[PDB]
Amino acid sequence: MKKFPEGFLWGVATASYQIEGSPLADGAGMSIWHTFSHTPGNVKNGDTGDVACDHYNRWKEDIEIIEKIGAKAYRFSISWPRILPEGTGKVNQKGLDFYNRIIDTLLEKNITPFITIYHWDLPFSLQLKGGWANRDIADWFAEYSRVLFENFGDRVKHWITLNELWVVAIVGHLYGVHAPGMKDIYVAFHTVHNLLRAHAKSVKVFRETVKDGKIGIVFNNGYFEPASEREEDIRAARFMHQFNNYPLFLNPIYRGEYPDLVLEFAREYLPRNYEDDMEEIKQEIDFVGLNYYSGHMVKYDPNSPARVSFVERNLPKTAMGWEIVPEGIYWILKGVKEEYNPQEVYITGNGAAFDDVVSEGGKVHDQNRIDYLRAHIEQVWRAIQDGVPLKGYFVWSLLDNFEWAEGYSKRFGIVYVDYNTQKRIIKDSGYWYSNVIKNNGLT
Numbered sequence: 347m348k349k350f351p352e353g354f355l356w357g358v359a360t361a362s363y364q365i366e367g368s369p370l371a372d373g374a375g376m377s378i379w380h381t382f383s384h385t386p387g388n389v390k391n392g393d394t395g396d397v398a399c400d401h402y403n404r405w406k407e408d409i410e411i412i413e414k415i416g417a418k419a420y421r422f423s424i425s426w427p428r429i430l431p432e433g434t435g436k437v438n439q440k441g442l443d444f445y446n447r448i449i450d451t452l453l454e455k456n457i458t459p460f461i462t463i464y465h466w467d468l469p470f471s472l473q474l475k476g477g478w479a480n481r482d483i484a485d486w487f488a489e490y491s492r493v494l495f496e497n498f499g500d501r502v503k504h505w506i507t508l509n510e511l512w513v514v515a516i517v518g519h520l521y522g523v524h525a526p527g528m529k530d531i532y533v534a535f536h537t538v539h540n541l542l543r544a545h546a547k548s549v550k551v552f553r554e555t556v557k558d559g560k561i562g563i564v565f566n567n568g569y570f571e572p573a574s575e576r577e578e579d580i581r582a583a584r585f586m587h588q589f590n591n592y593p594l595f596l597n598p599i600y601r602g603e604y605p606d607l608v609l610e611f612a613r614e615y616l617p618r619n620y621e622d623d624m625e626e627i628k629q630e631i632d633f634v635g636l637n638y639y640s641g642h643m644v645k646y647d648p649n650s651p652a653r654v655s656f657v658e659r660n661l662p663k664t665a666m667g668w669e670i671v672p673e674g675i676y677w678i679l680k681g682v683k684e685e686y687n688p689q690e691v692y693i694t695g696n697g698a699a700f701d702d703v704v705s706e707g708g709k710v711h712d713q714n715r716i717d718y719l720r721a722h723i724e725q726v727w728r729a730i731q732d733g734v735p736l737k738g739y740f741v742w743s744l745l746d747n748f749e750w751a752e753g754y755s756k757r758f759g760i761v762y763v764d765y766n767t768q769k770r771i772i773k774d775s776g777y778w779y780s781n782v783i784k785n786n787g788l789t
Contacts, residue, residue, distance in 0.1 A: 348727045348788040355458065355738030356783045357419030358412060358760070359695050361465035361509070363395045364747040366425065368402035372440035375431030377467035378477065382525035393753025399745050400768050402444070407770065409451050411761055412744065415776055416783045419458040421694055421740050422448070423465030423509065426490060433469040434486050442497055449501050460694075460740075461498065462506040462564070463491055463548065466514060466525065466750075473526050478514065478537035481617075487544035488551050499556035506635060506694070507545045510566040511595055515541060523751050535615035542598055542627045549629040560632035564694045567591040569641035569674025573657050578646035581607070582654045586644050589652075592636065592682055598627050600686045611652050633737070634686075635694035638678055638722075640664075641671030664718070665699040665756060672721035679729035679736065690735055695742035696722050699749070699756040702773065710762045710773040719775060723788060741779060745770070 363369075363379045370376065383394040401408060412420055427433070428441035452459050464487070468477055472486060491507070508514070518524040520534040528534075545563055552561045568590055572583035587593065588605035597605040602624045604616070617623075647655035661669045675696065682691060698718040702710050719741065730736050746759035754765060760776035763769070782788065 347785065348724060349785075350727065350787045351730065352786075354736075354786060355419040355692075356417055356779075357421055357458075357460065357738055357740035358415070358417045358744040359421040359740045359742050360401075360744050360747065361423045361462065362425040362428075363398075363465070363467045364743075364749070365399040365401040365745055367396060367398040367400045369395055369425075371402060372428075372444070373431060373438045374425065374441065375427035375433070376470040377425065377427050378470055378473050378525035379467050381470055381473075382527055385527070388527060389751055390753045390755055393748065393755075395748050397765075398748050399763050401745075404768060405448055406451060408745065409448070409455065409457070411770060411772065412457055413455045415760070415772070415780045417457065417744075417779075418783070419460055419504075419738060419740065420452055420744075421460040421462060421506070423462035423467075424494060425467050426464065427467065427469040427471075429493060430469065430490055431471075433472040434489055437493055445498065449498060453501060458504060459502045460504040460506065461494070461502050462509050463494060464507065465509040466518075468525070477526055478519070478540050479533050481540060481543070483540055484543040484547050488547035491548040492551050492555065495552060495555040495559075499559055503556070503559045505552065505556070505559060505561045507548045507561065507563050508541055509564045509694075510637065511538070511541045511545075511563070512590060513566050532615050535612050536617055538594065539617050539620050539623070542595060543623055546627045546629045549631060560690075562631055562633035562635050562690075562692070563595070564635035564637060565592040565595060566637050567678050569638075569671050569677055570644050571641065573643055573645035576646075579644070582644045582646045585611070585652065585654055586642070587681075591678070592634065593685065596634070596682075596686050598624060599631070600628075602628060631688075633690035633692060634682060634688040635692045636678060636682060637695035637742070638675045638693065639666075639696065639698070639742075640668035641674040642669065665701050666752070668698075670698075670718060670721075672718075672725045674725075675722050676725040676729050679726065679734045680732060683734045688735070690737050692737055693726060693739045695740055696726075697742040697758050697760075699758050702746075702757050702762055704762065704764075704771065708771060710771055710775075712773045712775045715760070715773065715775040716778050719779065720788065723782065727787065 515537040522529040570586040572579035585607040746757040746763040749756035762771040
C-alpha cells in the first residue's frame with residue numbers, strides 16, 4: 347500500500363458562488379460575479395450563478411453526501427455580500443444563520459470545517475469604489491474577517507484568507523476573463539499588492555479573536571517546464587513559476603520582497619513605495635494551501651508579453667484542454683518545502699473536468715477522473731515520503747458546479763448534478779475516493 351500518515355485529512359472543496367444559487371435571497375447584496383455573469387458575452391452560454399446546484403436550499407443533503415463518502419474535512423467559502431451587503435457596516439443576520447447551520451451540522455457529523463473567507467464574490471458596493479484596486483480594501487477586508495471570526499471562531503479552527511490571489515489579480519484585472527472584467531496591467535499589480543495587505547490585516551485580527559485557531563492562504567499553481575536546456579528557456583520557466591505560483595506571494599511573506607524575475611518585469615506596475623508595506627505583510631501564518639491541476643511547457647519568445655510563450659504538447663488533456671502531468675504536484679510540493687519550508691502544507695484543490703454521462707441504471711462511470719485522481723494522489727504520497735509536511739488533500743470538487751467563465755459546461759464533481767432536477771448522483775470517482783479514505787491511501 348501507499349499508506350498516508352496517521353490523522354491525514356482527506357477532504358472535499360467547493361465555493362459559495364459556484365454552488366449556492368439564490369445570490370440576492372434574504373437581504374444579500376450583489377456580488378461582482380452576479381454583475382459580471384449578467385453581462386452578455388462574459389460567460390459561456392450566458393450562464394450565471396442564479397441557481398447553480400441550489401445549495402442554498404439543499405445544503406443538508408449535500409453534507410449527508412460528504413458524510414456518506416467519509417471525507418473528514420470540507421473546505422467551503424463564505425459569500426461576503428450575504429454577511430455585509432454593502433461590504434462594510436450593517437451585518438445581515440440571515441447570512442450568519444445560513445452558515446451557522448452548515449457549521450453546526452458539519453461538527454455534529456465529525457467533519458472538520460476549513461473556511462475560505464474570500465473565494466471571489468466581492469460585494470459590488472466595494473467594486474464601485476475600486477474593489478481590489480483601492481488600498482482601503484485591506485481595512486474593509488479586516489473588518490469583514492472580524493465579523494466571521496467573532497461569529498464562527500468558537501467552532502471553526504481552520505481558516506483561509508484568500509483563494510487563488512494570482513487568479514483574482516491577473517485573470518480578473520489583466521486578462522478581463524474573470525470578474526470584475528478589466529484589462530490594465532497597472533491595476534493588476536496594484537491588486538496583487540492589496541491582496542497581500544488584506545491577507546495580512548486579516549491574520550492580525552485573527553490572532554486577537556481566535557487564539558486557539560489556525561489561519562492560512564491558498565495559491566493556484568502550475569508545473570512549468572522549459573522547452574529546452576537553453577539558458578533563456580530555463581529562465582522563462584522560472585519566470586512563470588515565480589509569477590504564476592506560490593512565490594509571487596510567499597517571497598514577500600517569507601523574504602520581504604517580490605521574486606526577482608517578477609520584479610524585473612513588473613516593478614513599474616506595483617504601487618510606488620510598496621516596500622513601506624512589507625513589514626506588515628510579513629505576519630506569521632499556520633499553513634500553506636496549494637491548489638494544482640496541470641502543467642505547461644514554456645519557451646523564451648522575444649515578441650510575447652514578458653518574453654514568454656506556451657508551447658502546446660501532445661499529452662492527455664482534460665475537458666478544459668489542460669495537460670495532465672501528475673509529477674507536477676510532486677515538484678510543486680517539493681518546491682514549496684525547499685524554497686520556503688512551511689511548517690504545514692495542504693493540497694486545497696486537485697481534480698479534473700471530463701464530460702460525464704449518466705448510464706444505464708443512473709451510474710456515472712468516470713474512469714477518466716479516477717485515473718487522474720490516482721496518479722496525482724500517488725505523487726502526493728511520494729512528496730510526503732521525501733519530507734513535505736503535508737497534513738491533508740482536498741478534491742476539487744464535491745459537486746459539479748458553475749466553472750466561472752465556462753459556466754456549467756465543465757464538470758469537476760465527484761458527485762454529478764443534474765441541473766434539470768437538482769438530483770445528485772455519486773460518481774464512480776466518489777465511491778473510489780471513499781475507499782481511499784477507508785484505507786488511508788492507495789490499494
